Amino acid sequence: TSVIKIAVEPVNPSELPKMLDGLRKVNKSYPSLTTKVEESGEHVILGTGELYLDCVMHDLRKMYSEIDIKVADPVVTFCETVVETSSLKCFAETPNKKNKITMIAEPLEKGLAEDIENEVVQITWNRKKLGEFFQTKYDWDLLAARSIWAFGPDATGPNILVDDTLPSEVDKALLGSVKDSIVQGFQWGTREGPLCDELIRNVKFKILDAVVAQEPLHRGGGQIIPTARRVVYSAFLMATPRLMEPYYFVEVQAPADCVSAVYTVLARRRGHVTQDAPIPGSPLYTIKAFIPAIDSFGFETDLRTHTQGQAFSLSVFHHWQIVPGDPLDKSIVIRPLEPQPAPHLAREFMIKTRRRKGLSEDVSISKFFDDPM
Amino acid sequence: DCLIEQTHPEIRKRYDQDLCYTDILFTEQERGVGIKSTPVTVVLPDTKG
Amino acid sequence: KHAVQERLAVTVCINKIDRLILELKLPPTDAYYKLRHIVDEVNGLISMY
Amino acid sequence: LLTDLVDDNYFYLFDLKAFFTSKALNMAIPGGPKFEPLVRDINLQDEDWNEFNDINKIIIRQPIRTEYKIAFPYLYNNLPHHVHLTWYHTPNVVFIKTEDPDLPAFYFDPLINPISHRHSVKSQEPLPDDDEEFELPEFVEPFLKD
RNA sequence: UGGUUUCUCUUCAGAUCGCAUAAAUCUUUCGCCUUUUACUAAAGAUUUCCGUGGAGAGGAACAACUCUG
| 3-class SS letters over D81-135 | CCCCCCCCCCCCCCCCCCCCCCCCCCCCCCCCCCCCCCCCCCCCCCCHHHHHHHH
Contacts of A282 in chain C (CB under 8 A): 24
Looking only at the bridges linking them, the beta strands covering A199-200 and A79-82 are parallel
Could you tell me which chain A residue has the CA closest to the CA of C34?
A281
Instruction: Look at chain D and count its residues.
Output: 146
- Whether A58 and chain B come into contact, CB under 8 Å, resolves to yes
From the list D121, D123, D21, the residue with the least C-alpha distance to D76 is D21
Q: At what angle do helices A260-268 and A299-306 cross, to 10 degrees?
A: 140
Centre a 10 Å sphere on the Cβ of residue C17 and count the other Cβ atoms it contains: 11
Given 3-state DSSP classes, what are the helix, strand and coil percentages for chain C, each rounded to the nearest 5?
55, 0, 45
Could you tell me which chain A residue has the CA closest to the CA of D53?
A72
User: Which residues have C-beta within 8 Å of that of residue A191, sequence separation ≥ 6?
Assistant: A153, A199, A200
Which partners does chain B have (≥3 C-beta pairs < 8 Å)?
A, D
- The SS3 assignment for A229 reads helix
Centre a 10 Å sphere on the Cβ of residue A246 and count the other Cβ atoms it contains: 21
User: Which residues have C-beta within 8 Å of that of residue A343, sequence separation ≥ 6?
Assistant: A324, A325
Is residue B39 within 8 A of residue B21, CB to CB? The reply is no
User: Of all nucleotides in the shown strands, which has a C1' nearest the CA of D41?
Assistant: E29
Q: A165, exposed or middle or buried, with CB in 10 Å at 0-12, 13-18, 19+?
A: middle
Which residue in C21, C27, C34 is closest to D107 by CB distance? C27
From the list A216, A221, A209, A153, the residue with the least C-alpha distance to A181 is A221
CA angle A142, A147, A153 (to 5 degrees): 125
Is residue D77 within 8 A of residue A69, CB to CB? The reply is no
Contacts of C34 in chain A (CB under 8 A): 280-281
- The SS3 assignment for A218 reads coil
Establish whether C16 is an annotated binding residue: yes
Measure B34 CA to nearest chain A CA, in Å.
9
Q: At what angle do helices A16-29 and A50-62 cross, to 10 degrees?
A: 130
Experimental technique, in short, is cryo-EM
Centre a 10 Å sphere on the Cβ of residue B17 and count the other Cβ atoms it contains: 6
User: Which residues have C-beta within 8 Å of that of residue A89, sequence separation ≥ 6?
Assistant: A102, A103, A104, A208
Is residue A202 within 8 A of residue A193, CB to CB? The reply is no
Q: A133, exposed or middle or buried, with CB in 10 Å at 0-12, 13-18, 19+?
A: middle
CA distance A282 to A255: 9
Is residue A287 within 8 A of residue A273, CB to CB? The reply is yes
Given 3-state DSSP classes, what are the helix, strand and coil percentages for chain B, each rounded to the nearest 5?
25, 0, 75
Q: What is the resolution of this structure in A?
A: 4.2
Is residue A202 within 8 A of residue A107, CB to CB? The reply is yes
Q: Residue C16: left (phi > 0), alpha (psi -120 to 50), or beta?
A: left
CA of D32 to C1' of E23 (A): 27
Establish whether C1 is an annotated binding residue: no
